[PDB]
Amino acid sequence: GLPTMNTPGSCQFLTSDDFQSPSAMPQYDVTPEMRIPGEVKNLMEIAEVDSVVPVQNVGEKVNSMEAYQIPVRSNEGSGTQVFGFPLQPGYSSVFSRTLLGEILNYYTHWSGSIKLTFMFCGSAMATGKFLLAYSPPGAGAPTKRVDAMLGTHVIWDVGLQSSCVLCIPWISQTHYRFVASDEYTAGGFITCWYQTNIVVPADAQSSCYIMCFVSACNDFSVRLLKDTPFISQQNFF
Amino acid sequence: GLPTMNTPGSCQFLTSDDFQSPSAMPQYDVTPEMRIPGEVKNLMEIAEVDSVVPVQNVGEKVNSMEAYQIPVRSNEGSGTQVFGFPLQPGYSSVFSRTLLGEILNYYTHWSGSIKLTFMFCGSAMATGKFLLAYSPPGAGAPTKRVDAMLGTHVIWDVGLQSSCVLCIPWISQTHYRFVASDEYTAGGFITCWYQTNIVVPADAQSSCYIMCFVSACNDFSVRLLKDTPFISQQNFF
Amino acid sequence: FCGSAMATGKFLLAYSPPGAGAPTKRVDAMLGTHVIWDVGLQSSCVLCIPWISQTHYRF
Amino acid sequence: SDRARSITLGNSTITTQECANVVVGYGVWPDYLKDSEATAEDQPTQPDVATCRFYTLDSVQWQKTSPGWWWKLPDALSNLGLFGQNMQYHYLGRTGYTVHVQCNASKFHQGCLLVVCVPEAEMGCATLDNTPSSAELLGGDTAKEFADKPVASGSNKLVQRVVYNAGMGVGVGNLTIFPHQWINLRTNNSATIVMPYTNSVPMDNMFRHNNVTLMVIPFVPLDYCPGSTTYVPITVTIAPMCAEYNGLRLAG
Amino acid sequence: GAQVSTQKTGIHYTNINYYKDAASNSANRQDFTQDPGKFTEPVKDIMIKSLPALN
Amino acid sequence: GAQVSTQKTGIHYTNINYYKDAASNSANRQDFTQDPGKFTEPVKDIMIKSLPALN
Amino acid sequence: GAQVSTQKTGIHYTNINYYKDAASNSANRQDFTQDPGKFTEPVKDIMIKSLPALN
Amino acid sequence: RVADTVGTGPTNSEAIPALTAAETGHTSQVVPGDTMQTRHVKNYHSRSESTIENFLCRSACVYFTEYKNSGAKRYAEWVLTPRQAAQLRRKLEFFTYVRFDLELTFVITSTQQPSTTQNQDAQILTHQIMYVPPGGPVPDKVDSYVWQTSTNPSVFWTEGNAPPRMSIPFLSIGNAYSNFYDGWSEFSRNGVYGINTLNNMGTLYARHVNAGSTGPIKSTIRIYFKPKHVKAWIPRPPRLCQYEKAKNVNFQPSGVTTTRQSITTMTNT
Ligand SMILES: O=C(O)c1ccc(NS(=O)(=O)c2ccc(N3C(=O)c4ccccc4C3=O)cc2)cc1
Ligand SMILES: O=C(O)c1ccc(NS(=O)(=O)c2ccc(N3C(=O)c4ccccc4C3=O)cc2)cc1
Numbered sequence A, B: 001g002l003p004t005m006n007t008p009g010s011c012q013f014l015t016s017d018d019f020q021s022p023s024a025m026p027q028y029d030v031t032p033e034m035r036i037p038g039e040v041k042n043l044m045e046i047a048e049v050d051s052v053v054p055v056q057n058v059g060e061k062v063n064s065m066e067a068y069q070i071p072v073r074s075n076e077g078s079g080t081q082v083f084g085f086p087l088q089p090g091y092s093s094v095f096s097r098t099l100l101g102e103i104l105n106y107y108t109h110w111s112g113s114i115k116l117t118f119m120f121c122g123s124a125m126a127t128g129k130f131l132l133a134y135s136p137p138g139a140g141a142p143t144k145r146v147d148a149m150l151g152t153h154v155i156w157d158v159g160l161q162s163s164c165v166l167c168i169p170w171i172s173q174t175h176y177r178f179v180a181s182d183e184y185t186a187g188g189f190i191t192c193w194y195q196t197n198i199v200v201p202a203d204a205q206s207s208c209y210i211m212c213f214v215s216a217c218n219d220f221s222v223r224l225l226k227d228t229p230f231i232s233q234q235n236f237f
Numbered sequence C: 001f002c003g004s005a006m007a008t009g010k011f012l013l014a015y016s017p018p019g020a021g022a023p024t025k026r027v028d029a030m031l032g033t034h035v036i037w038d039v040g041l042q043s044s045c046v047l048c049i050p051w052i053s054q055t056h057y058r059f
Numbered sequence D: 001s002d003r004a005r006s007i008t009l010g011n012s013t014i015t016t017q018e019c020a021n022v023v024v025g026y027g028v029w030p031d032y033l034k035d036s037e038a039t040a041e042d043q044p045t046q047p048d049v050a051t052c053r054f055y056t057l058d059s060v061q062w063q064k065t066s067p068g069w070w071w072k073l074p075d076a077l078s079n080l081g082l083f084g085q086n087m088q089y090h091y092l093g094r095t096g097y098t099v100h101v102q103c104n105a106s107k108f109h110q111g112c113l114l115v116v117c118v119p120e121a122e123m124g125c126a127t128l129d130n131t132p133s134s135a136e137l138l139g140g141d142t143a144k145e146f147a148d149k150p151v152a153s154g155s156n157k158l159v160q161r162v163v164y165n166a167g168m169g170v171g172v173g174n175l176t177i178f179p180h181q182w183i184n185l186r187t188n189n190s191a192t193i194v195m196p197y198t199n200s201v202p203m204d205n206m207f208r209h210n211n212v213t214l215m216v217i218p219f220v221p222l223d224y225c226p227g228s229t230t231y232v233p234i235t236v237t238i239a240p241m242c243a244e245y246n247g248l249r250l251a252g
Numbered sequence E, F, G: 001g002a003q004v005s006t007q008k009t010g011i012h013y014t015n016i017n018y019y020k021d022a023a024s025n026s027a028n029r030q031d032f033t034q035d036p037g038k039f040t041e042p043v044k045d046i047m048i049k050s051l052p053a054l055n
Numbered sequence H: 001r002v003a004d005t006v007g008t009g010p011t012n013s014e015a016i017p018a019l020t021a022a023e024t025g026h027t028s029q030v031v032p033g034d035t036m037q038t039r040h041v042k043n044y045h046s047r048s049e050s051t052i053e054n055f056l057c058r059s060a061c062v063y064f065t066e067y068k069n070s071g072a073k074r075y076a077e078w079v080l081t082p083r084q085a086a087q088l089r090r091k092l093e094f095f096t097y098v099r100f101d102l103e104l105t106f107v108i109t110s111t112q113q114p115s116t117t118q119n120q121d122a123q124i125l126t127h128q129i130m131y132v133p134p135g136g137p138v139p140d141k142v143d144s145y146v147w148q149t150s151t152n153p154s155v156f157w158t159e160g161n162a163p164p165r166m167s168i169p170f171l172s173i174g175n176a177y178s179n180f181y182d183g184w185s186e187f188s189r190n191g192v193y194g195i196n197t198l199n200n201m202g203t204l205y206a207r208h209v210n211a212g213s214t215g216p217i218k219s220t221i222r223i224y225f226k227p228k229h230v231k232a233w234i235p236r237p238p239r240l241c242q243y244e245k246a247k248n249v250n251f252q253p254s255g256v257t258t259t260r261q262s263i264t265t266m267t268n269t
């Protein structure tokens, strides 16, 4: 016949290969398709959807709904911190089990902007202002309000419209950052402070909560598939 | 199926082969390129760059900067030799660890012209003349100035313009010469003499130095890749 | 420069705007306007002092 | 004529009477980052004439026995001017340099220097299972010096400094592929190199990466007869080129 | 009956189908259409950013 | 979709790409462009041989 | 880029070169040019048979 | 490529191509016809073996590890670097920044180990090599759930066939791999020096999928890297010293060259 020669990689099973293989059932006609609502064609469709972030998660809070709630209250003075967590989804305790964060433990690399939304869930007599800050890395976390207003920030005023978005720009030396912890591809720190006290009248609760959401922007992308560390087994089920 | 027949060389791993092989990560998009200064596309680009030659290298000189320095001084008469080394880069002690010489221990064959540059590093009151000679092989090294002026030579006069180039023509029976020592592809000998004494006034040093440089010309080429004898190991690092 | 023709040297000719007192080190004086003067043939160099003033005239 | 040169950046002006031309990088002149190579999405800070101007570093004596000197580039200007005050408030920045080395001596003196700007000059440690500390590599406008004899191996965080290996384990006579000039005292008294920004990322933090290292190495020692000047300094002057900074935060 | 298509790059390749069943063909790797607007913005009224979400 | 290119001689060969990734292709052996003028002559002023390098 | 050449007979075959080096090609079997006149008749003067070789 | 020599006759001129100033940092462009009478030569030489995509594009053994079908050391772990083995490492360090695609090729061999087991009778061995991208689960034993390979690239190879091979893209987060890093990853400038995450490209695991024999068999896997589609920037002086460590540039001070008797002698010692 036709003289041929085999090359390295013949008679191997590579799990990522695409080759054609004969059907075991030939001339089998499959059932028609129907239009089912909500077809998914990309996983960045469903990473652009808001998901409640468990900011609190200190001891026994993860075994309750108190994880999702962020305390804020009427206190003396202002310029006290409300929360702080580091930017690094798919590593951080805060972000690893969010909807964004679990489409990001299947990938090694990530790029793009992330938008946090906050929703004030006090009474309609409560009012206040917050400073929602993001600091690039290289100087540690800000420990005062005056240190935190030197970074990117938004001042949020609560009225009608009970949410505000802090969009986190992409500021990185590299085009991608590792999903896993590395100090070369450090993300920075996201902190919140009282710009002004929570002020309430009599007969309205002086303790209120904030809920946080996280989603990707439209410039976001992920790269390089890998197994997730979050599912295990000891035997077949 | 299609009748085929296998030939000798099937199911071998030849280390120099070019064949296509499936990617283990399919549809992976690589990071964009940026223009980084100083892209290299050929190694004859970087063999055409001058590199200081350690002409001296006699005993304890190789463990100092005295290797690179060539003594010249005011002496009685003239027609005394300054240095001599054989033409054979990638073998000779003088040339094997020069920048030219180390892109030439990865190759078996070499061809073309080589240009030596000399730079006088006396004071600006010092003056002198030299005879920079090259003798083709077949009569041994010249042992007198009058034997050395029968070959290719340049008389170098020191003034403003403190360098002079001795370009070594290609004069060979064969189109290529071996990198390694062979007497069939002998190179010849490069020697230097006082054409005139070094003359200085009072209060200026009568001892001066010369530095030598080496680079390939634009007609230079190398052929036939091989392992270099200059890197070793006993175990993995 | 009115040395001999074998003498050579370099100088830093500086001008500092006011508001921080006179510079007391070379490294303080190179943060203002300056010219590095090299002596060779051409034995003069000009330090031109720009007009940097809040007002249009000075007393 | 060909020996006269003047370079004006900001306030500063340099003038030389003996000049060997200007070497420019890899034939690439400093430029601002393009929007088709940029990654960071914030608006840059470009201070212009408050960063891009000549800064003189401390002088260092050239003696008959001197082995050489090195300065690591962004961290030798880190305490100087508003160049130093933009790189501690920002996470990122990129810049090229113009390095000018001066050294004048009479026509009865002799010696030769090699002036090189070496991209990413990573330097060995005296002890082979340790890496150097940051107090042995970085000056701050003070020069670090080479040695002429091997550094003994203790339990050191010391650099292995020897002139002939250049502290990197390479031949010192092969450093001539890097942008370079020679100061030969019978010809010229100054050397000018213009480096462009060289990195594998478009901007980088400058307080933990040094992307260039200047080295001044005697190849022919200083020599003179009795009656001449015995003190010959070497001054280094460095100007940023097209500095940008991005990622404004708190100082540190 | 060969198809010629572009490769994933920062050229072209050739493919012939050898079997009579369309379930024997290699996987479809290069389909990049997407529409996140079903899961984001499922609201009946059109939201305009730079205007109140609630009047 | 075959490419036909010249061989290294002191004829021609045919090549088809079989994979959908451009990192699966055979090595580029025949790119011979070069420019030594970045590393030799990096000087700002144009040097003319047959004229003084320094006036 | 196939060559079609005649076979040795008392038809035609097809050949494609698969490699980028011209030292990888199959042997040249069908080159039948010859010239025995270098080794026979190397004489300066033209010899005519049917005439004396020496007058 | 190679240029043609041009003929030249006698001169006596104010031209001075031979004289130059080497202080300018410029390599002289003198050709042989400048300094002497030459004939015209046609050159047909080429510079095709000294392309960067010829120099670096040959398979080179980077590492080898061993593992057994019994006892301890049931699998082999290796973090992919081209810096364990001297020869490949030196070639890449003619450059500061490189960018390439790998082709991995594995030569897997097996050797019967001495034992007092009576009536050994091996079945054919099948081996699994599993590439794990940075992060994610790491096998801690043979027979863990990590060898499922649901999303990790993996190959299976039975003995007496052709070596496996696979292509790897350019996997850097940067725009080129760096062979040198003059910095710290920490902002404090403490910790390890010269350590960077631009050159991460996972870990490789290898095991037997069956113990074929009742007796002990030990396998050796050798990994070969072949760069291809190469681009390289900023050339550097070659390494003069022997390497000591795979993560450091540390060296023992070495002389410039080997010695010889005199500065006029025509032989080496
Ligand atoms: O290697 C893999 O592909 C592979 C290994 C483990 C695996 N999942 S597991 O939950 O870790 C698991 C671990 C062990 C066993 N298992 C055994 O090891 C075994 C031995 C003998 C009889 C039955 C069994 C059996 O159920 C089954 C599952 C899946 C695949
Ligand atoms: O043959 C080659 O491809 C090969 C042989 C040697 C080699 N490099 S080496 O530095 O000479 C070297 C020499 C020996 C070993 N080595 C052993 O021989 C060995 C035996 C048993 C366990 C561990 C090892 C082990 O590290 C490792 C490296 C690379 C490849």
Ligand SMILES: *C(=O)CCCCCCCCCCCCC
Binding pocket: E001, E002, E016, E017, E018, E019
């Ligand atoms: C269209 O299909 C014709 C184009 C040329 C086909 C070349 C076919 C290659 C060899 C046969 C593959 C047959 C698979 C059953």
Ligand SMILES: *C(=O)CCCCCCCCCCCCC
Binding pocket: E002, E004, E013, E014, E015, E016, F001, F002, F016, F017, F018, F019
């Ligand atoms: C262009 O590609 C069409 C030219 C003729 C193609 C012949 C194809 C040879 C056999 C198929 C190779 C297919 C590889 C997936």
Ligand SMILES: *C(=O)CCCCCCCCCCCCC
Binding pocket: F002, F004, F013, F014, F015, F016, G001, G002, G016, G017, G018, G019
């Ligand atoms: C000219 O070469 C095109 C003619 C048709 C080519 C059919 C090719 C046969 C299969 C591919 C051989 C490729 C060898 C690398």
